[PDB]
Every structure is written in structure tokens, then in C-alpha cells.
Swiss-Prot record, chains A, B:
D-glucuronate binds at D162, N399, N454, Y460, E493, W538, K557. Belongs to the glycosyl hydrolase 2 family. This is Beta-glucuronidase. Inhibited by a set of synthetic compounds like thio-urea derivatives and analogs. Inhibitors of gut microbial beta-glucuronidases are expected to block the reactivation of glucuronidated cancer drugs, and to alleviate drug-induced GI toxicity. Its EC number is 3.2.1.31. It comes from Streptococcus agalactiae serotype V (strain ATCC BAA-611 / 2603 V/R). GO terms for biological process: carbohydrate metabolic process; glucuronoside catabolic process. GO terms for molecular function: beta-galactosidase activity; beta-glucuronidase activity; carbohydrate binding. A motif (N-K motif) lies at residues 555-557. Pfam families: Glyco_hydro_2, Glyco_hydro_2_C, Glyco_hydro_2_N.
Amino acid sequence: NAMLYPLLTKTRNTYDLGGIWNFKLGEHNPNELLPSDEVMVIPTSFNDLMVSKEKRDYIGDFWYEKVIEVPKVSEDEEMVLRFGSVTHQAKIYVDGVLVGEHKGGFTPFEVLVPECKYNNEKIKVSICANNVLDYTTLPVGNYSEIIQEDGSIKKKVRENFDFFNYAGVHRPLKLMIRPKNHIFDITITSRLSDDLQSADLHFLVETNQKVDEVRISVFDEDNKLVGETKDSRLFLSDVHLWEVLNAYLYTARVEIFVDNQLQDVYEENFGLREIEVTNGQFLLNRKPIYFKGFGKHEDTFINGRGLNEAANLMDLNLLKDMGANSFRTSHYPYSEEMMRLADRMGVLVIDEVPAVGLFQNDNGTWNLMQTKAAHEQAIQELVKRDKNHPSVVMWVVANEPASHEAGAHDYFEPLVKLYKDLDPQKRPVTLVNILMATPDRDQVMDLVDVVCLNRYYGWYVDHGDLTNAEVGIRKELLEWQDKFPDKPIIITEYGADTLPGLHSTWNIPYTEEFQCDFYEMSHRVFDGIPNLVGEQVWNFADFETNLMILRVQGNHKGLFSRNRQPKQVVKEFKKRWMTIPHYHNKKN
Amino acid sequence: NAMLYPLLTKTRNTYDLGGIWNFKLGEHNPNELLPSDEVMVIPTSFNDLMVSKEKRDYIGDFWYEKVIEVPKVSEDEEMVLRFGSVTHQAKIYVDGVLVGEHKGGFTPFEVLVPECKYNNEKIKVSICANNVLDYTTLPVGNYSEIIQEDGSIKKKVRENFDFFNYAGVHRPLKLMIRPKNHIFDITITSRLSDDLQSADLHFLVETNQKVDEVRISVFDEDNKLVGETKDSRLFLSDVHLWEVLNAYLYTARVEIFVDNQLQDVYEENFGLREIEVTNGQFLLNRKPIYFKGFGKHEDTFINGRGLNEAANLMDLNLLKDMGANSFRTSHYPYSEEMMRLADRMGVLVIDEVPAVGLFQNDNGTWNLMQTKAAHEQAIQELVKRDKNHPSVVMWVVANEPASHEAGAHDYFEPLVKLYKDLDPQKRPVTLVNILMATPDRDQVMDLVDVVCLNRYYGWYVDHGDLTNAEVGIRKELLEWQDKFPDKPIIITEYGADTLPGLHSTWNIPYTEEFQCDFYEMSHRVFDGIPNLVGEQVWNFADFETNLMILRVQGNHKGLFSRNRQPKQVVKEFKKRWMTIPHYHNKKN
Ligand SMILES: [Mg+2]
Ligand SMILES: [Mg+2]
């Protein structure tokens, strides 16, 4: 139900509830008042703000609590709490009463404040967050309980993924006063003309109640009126297209009317562009694109997975300065803020649900992977939240699932359909593939539009041995190309752990020089694979992980450090990506 | 035949041949003259002096060559070339003629220069070194050949050990002019009195030819004469014992005589001390010792495995400043220079042969481990070279062999006997044990006097999880103690990779703080195991290895960096080891 970015309009009062909240790890009676012994900030991951390991590794319930003043709410209005997200599960209390609930740590939801409380001076909001991951959650966790002889129970999650399980309220929480009868959803659809110069627009507006009139006023980047309709249909002559690294955004002001008066007004941006996949190519505006960019993480010192709009912008500025043009939201939906920024900057985005960890670890006879419900929900929420973004060019169903094992096809078949059935634009959906699932073994890739591969020849296979890595990477890309002559291929991950300061004359893995050598070898291969249409390094920047022997205080495959300072290899990518055009047809 | 340290005496002219030699990787006709295009230094590993990887990774023949002036050699003398060692195999040429040969990269050998060449002005010395490791060599290598389509053959060695395969002439080469009839060997034996105040000495002098008289003059540390014998027997009243960190060395001047005149004179040092193992204790001078120190490597920037006497001393100074008292020559005999220094400083030494890598990697039906010959030779050479060192308190037969697999017992049974049969002092022999070979599985430890364990709970098992590591380490030491109530236990390796500069509040492996935490947990366990009589960290200093994913530009488990700068944890060891006395009886 929370699919619309919270805006301030003359009919919608939006209040930011961020700041300091009373805070507690562990159990709490929401009928009672949390002390100010512990506090926590909203938004931010809580983990790094803890000074001890035991606290940073806490798993279970933890609470945020604040007494909040009730604004003026008129008879025809209602009041909702709107969360960008709570990680991973959340129960929301008003005055000690359970009033809403959510599962999924990376998508927004709203919670209605009971009408009977609108004439009160104050309300106490209590948020019971929970950071347990399961075989029933996304991402997938290995959950276990050990009794302490205390004998309290210690909960722990052995992540089935390579990123630290940051938890907390990572995204802005809003107190939202809006009309009872309001605009629930807006879907924007366009059919571009033969020559790509005009657009037949369809604005599909959802309401809960009867409306007399629905006026839509479209404005261009100069805020000049260029179209108006009362029937949901608009024809725009001589449009400006949304082009890679050269964005053009229209904004659709939607006003609804009952009995000759404004009931609700919302402003939704859209961009005009066409996506197609054919002949081993990714077409944007009917021209062949070459992806260059990064797998990313929402990760930063101090804030962990919490939203930092300034990091979004610093990254995006660097991306574009490098000559890059895209990135993937690995391994979970990013914040709305980041999406709106990619739109504004013309950056291509591969948008993914948190389906990472779908891989067991004899044996497995019993049904342990109960992920289907969460998966279906994740897909619905992402498409409903993100479908209007011109920057979203493709969906990902999973990252590195066990796609070579029996039962894989039948799990993904309906989920891929779901993206198609839900996306008005029917964008391509992909599946990101692990090295184990080789062309012969894999049994899922027939279902998808674009082949995405994470490959580390010269790092995990043939470690530090480029001569043989080259033969391996080339061999496999040729098998993929052959098995699917039709589909485009995108390297969604490739890189090499690199610690700033480590140096060698002898191409030594972990040194800055080896990072350069690794990418040279990789690009020499890619450039000779006709159906390979894009390359996205892992990772943009170094990032936090859990304790595992092959992680040297986090992942270090970043071109930048966690503090966003460049490694040696950045100069090299800048020379390469400024030489390859965005609209680059190889083939030729 | 090269068991005596090369000394200058009035009968023995010893010339250092070190410096610049013509040098070539690859094939060479020793009848022809190597150009001065390439040069190399003696002594040093060649690898790090190569600017390209292909050269640094070279495997096969490589040559050193120099024209050398012939000194005056009288009719009763002979001239030999004496090598501290050549790594790994060596063939020696004089004037293009093969004149001697050696296998084993860490022990000394001599090569007679043909008498017919003594009246020549010059001789050309050619050294064909070879750095191939095999299933027939020690250390054990995984050897393979791939044809290049050049089509030359690329030789490569996949080390079966965790240290970089440095090769070259690592130790001083001497041109040695000595009497035809000379002192070949001196073995020093002592029986100390009941109260440890006197010593019955037996000096066993080997000659090749008849001698009329053998006079032995013993001098104390003040060069004062305290004993003299002509019958090989000497009784010394009121001796000064060689004590841990408080060394006392006598020196035995051995003179031989034919027909009333000096034929040869040699000076051999010895120290007086008694070693015994009983009741789960290691007795030195009949008092229980507690080992504190390091596994080491002969490793240093630039020089690789080449001899650097100043590094020996800087390490030893640090060792003793820390309150430590021992170290192991892992994983190969150190230079004579280091041994003589340990004697002079009172440091205990566990002396080992290069028997590392005795572990396969289905299957194995065929006899692939042909290591027995090399093993027997290594043992003979080490005992013959090192038996007189008071600092050598124990022998190691192997490091981390597959001692849990069938056939292990029968391989080691005769090799352990060999140490006993060869060592006049019958010192303890041990075997250093890998984690796979657990008390139940292991089948070799009954053969040995002292239990040595390399254990990494909290690093390889239970990575970064101290709570569980503690239970594991304790559990296993209790099983060992139980299975062998008789034998002392020594932790010969324990530590944690640590990169200088990496820091965290949250006990994160690879950070300096975690290194400290890891050792605290380990010592808390050790202190409660009555039969554990010693602790030797891995490693003294960071060191070079080959390319393998869990090696971040070498091994970083060192308390010091490769440049010998301290990590955080050094302060901690200094507090602990200065509090534990050398003669420390736990039990109690
Ligand atoms: Mg199953
Ligand atoms: Mg066999």
C-alpha cells in the first residue's frame, strides 16, 4: 500500500520523524515507557554505533520508542506512519497497542494510526525491529539457537551471503496526514512513435473512493505546461527522450476532484525511453547499449546500511566522471532517494530483490528453502515501488541461486512470470549466475531475457594465474554464447580483493598492481565476445562483511575504498570507459 | 664430509668467494664462458632481484660462474670448495668438468678441486643450481611440465608447503686450503656429575690418516687453559654450565701431530648442559623448562632466504628482550651462523630437517612419496653438522606430515631410530602434528618423546569465534594429555594473520586488536594444561609465500612485520613472558 514517494502537497502534510529515539536491545513491554538510558538515531544501522561486539552481534527484538505530538487532523483526513524500510522485520505499536506489521528489510510500508487517537495531544510510537534471517526470509540466513547455561538463549544468524547483516531503521520514517479519499497509485505507460519523436501516454490513476474528475497536467524540465488530460490519455508531440547520462524528466501533476473541489494532488515524475532485447543486444531507444559500471552496496562507515543521500551523490558523480553509465542494486532494493537520483542523472539501474542466499550450505530430503512467499512479496513491492523509474531497465529474480540443482527451474518459472505480469513496461528480467552453474549444468537461464554472470577467473579459479584464467574465462563465455545465441550477456561481477598500500613488482594478488592486471586480462577477453554487451565491476567500493577467513576486515574488491578514496586501478577504468561510448554496437 | 665450520687456522686457509658472479637462468655449456650480461650476488636468493614475474618464477637450471685465482697450495695440502648450501640441487664444475654434486638445499657440502689444477694460475668455477622440488625431494613439491607451443617446456612447482620457494646460493661459499691429513670431525660428549658440578669429557677426533699424537686444549670464556689431554679424555672440576639465556662456552682446541710436528689445528666450541624428558616435563640441567618463543623463517626483504647475520642478531636481541628463550628452525636447518649465535646467547633451538609437505594434496594406489632417501640424508647431515651445539635441545622428524594415514608409523619408525642412532647425546626427537591428525586418528606420536602441535582454534577452526575456539583447544589438549600422560606437550604454532594498520573495536580477525585477543584466549587455556611445557608463536615475523587465496601478499601471522617493526601484540607478550620464568615448573 506504500507505493508512492511521500511528498508535501497542499493536500498532503508530510512530517519527518527522524532523530533521537529511546532504544533497547532485547525484550520490552510497549505498554511501559522505554528509558532514555540507550538512544538510537533514525535513520541508521544500529550495529556500528555499538562499542562492544556482543551488542553489535545481537540478534532478536530491539526497540525504538518516542512520544510524538499529534498535528491537526481534519474530519476528512487520516494519519499514517510511513517507513522507507525496517530491517528485517517490524511490529509497530501505538500507545502499547499492536497496530501494524511488516516482513522484508528493504521495502517501504505504511501503518494507519487509529482514528480514535486523532483528538489526543500525544501518541507513543513503539517500533519492535527484528533482525533474524531464516530459510523463510530474504536474504536467506542460517538460523540457530544455543542455550547459554545462563540459561538465556543466544540467537545467531550465519548469513548465507557475503555482506554484513546491518539492521535498524535504515530509511526515513514519515508521519503523513493525507485525505481519506486520496490517490493510491499512479502508473505511467507510454508508446513511443515509429521515429521515436512522439509518445502516446496513458496515466492510470488508482483511488479508493469515487472521484468526479481526474485532471493530469504534465510539465517539462522548464516547468512549462505541455499537456493536460481528463481522460487518462495524452499525446505528446516532439518529446525529449530520456537518454543515458543525459536525462530528461517530465513530471505528471495528478489532481482529483469531488463535487467541484480539490480532493488530493500528487506529482509523479516519468521519463520517456524504450527498452528491447534481441539478437544478443540490449537496445535503449532502439540503439545498442554497452553497460559500464558497478555492482554496489548501500554501505558506508558509521551508518552501515542507513541512508546517506550524500554518499549516493558522491558515488554517482564519480560513476559519471569515470565514463560509467550503470549499476546494480546488489543485493536488495536501494532507497527511493537513490532511484530518483539515478533518474535525474541518467544512470541505468539493474533493480534487484533480496533473493540472495538460495543455496544449501548428506543431505537435503526435507523442505528447508521456504522462501517462496517472501520472494513473491519482494517482487510485488519492488515493481509497485519502482515501475515508473526510467532508470530501471531490468529486473533480477535472484543472485547466485543454486540454478544447477533439480527443482530450480520450477521455483523460478512462476517468479519470472510474476515480473512480466506486474511490470507495465515488461522490462527484461535476468538471473545472476554462480560459477558452479556452468552452461551444461544450469537449468534456469532459458527462462530469462539476459544472461548475467559473476565470474572470477584469476581470483577464485586460477588464483593469481592470469595466463590460465584467460583461457578459462574465454572458454566459458564462448559456451554461453553458443548455448544462447539469442541472449545478451552481462558480466555483473568480476574483481579482485585489493588492500590500499599493498604493492609489488610481481603481479601479486591483493596488491594494487594486480587489480590493474586482472582487469586488463578480463577486458582483453570481453572485447572478443560479440554477445557480451556490458561489464559491471565488483565492487564500486569496499564494504562490510561478517567474519570469514577469506574476508580481510570486509570485502576489498572495490575500485574505491570504503572512504571513497581511489585505488590505482581507477585511472585505468577512466581511460577505458571514456574511450567506449555508451551507445556502442559491437558487431560492429 | 663437510661437517666442520670453516675456520682460519695456521694450517687452514679459508677464503671467501662471495660477491659478484656471472649469472644465467636456463641452459649453459660450462666449457664456454658465461657473459657478464646477467650477474648475481653470493650469498642471496635470486628471486627478488628479478624485476619480472616470469624470471622470479623460473624453474630449472640456473648458473653462477666466475674465474678464480689459484692461491699457493703446497705438496701436502689440498683445495676444496665448501658450500654452506645451494638451493635446491647443485652440480659443480671446474674448467667445464663435472667435479661434484649435491641434493638438499639447506645443508653444507664440499667439493675437491682436482690436484692436477693446483699449478694453474686460474680456475673457472661453474655452479649449476636447480630449484625443482618433487615427490623425491625435501621439501615436497608438486612438479609438472606444460609445453608452451613455443614449444619450449614450462616447468613449475606447486609447493606442498606454506613458504615461497626461494632458491640460489643462500650461504657463504669458501675456497678452503687444508692439510691432506686433517681433522675430519670432532664429536664432543660429556657426562655431568650427580650434583652437576663436574664433567667427564670425551673428545672423539676423526682423521683420514695415521696420527702420532692428538692434543686437546680446552679454554674457558676468559681464554684461560682449564684442561689438556692426549688420550681423548678430560675431567673438568667445577664447570660453568650452559644455562638458558645465560650461555657459557668452552672451546676445544684440537691439534694433531705426525713425527713431532703440527699437522692440523681446529677449534671447536662446546657447552655443558643436560637434557631429559620425564613425567610430562622437559628438564634442562635437571630443572623443568618452560619454552617461550617463535617459529621462525630464514626470510628477509631483498635477500629472501639468503644469509643475513644482522637479521639473526636483531631477531635474537628482540627475542631475549621479550623474555623469550627459544625458537624452531622451521622448516629446514638454519645457517651455521645462526646456530653459533644461539649458543653464544643461550637461546634454546628446536632443530628440524626439511620434511615438510609429506601429505597428498580418487586416489593414491601408486608409490608417489619417494622421499625416504632424501629424508635419511637430511637427518644424517643435520646431526653431523649440529650435534655439538648446546643450544640444540630437540630434533624434529617432520612438520605436519599425514600422520593419521595408513603407512605413517612404518615410514617414521626407522627415521626416529636414525636420530637416536646418530646423536651422541640422544636428544629428544619430536614430530610436529597437523589438526587433521587428532589424538584418536594419529598413529605416529607413540614413537616420539615430546608432543608438538600446530593448532589454530579461533583462526582456521571457529574463525574469529573465540568463545567456541576456547572449548575446542581445551578439549583437544585434554585428550592429548590423556592419551600420553607421560609426554610433554609443546604448542609449536598458533597465531592469526594480522596486517599492520588494520584496527577495530569489535575483535575482527586481521586487525591488530584481534591478534591480542586470540593470544589471551589461547594462554588462558594453556595455563590450565599441566603437561603443556612450552609455547611458540607462529610466527616471529611476516614472511614470503607463493600465490594462494588465503595468503595476503605472504603470511602475516608474525608478531613483527617483515621489516621487524612491532605489532600491537608485542607489548602483551613482553608483559607475559617477563612474568613467566624460564625454569618454570607448572605442577607446581
Ligand atoms: Mg530439499
Ligand atoms: Mg600411495
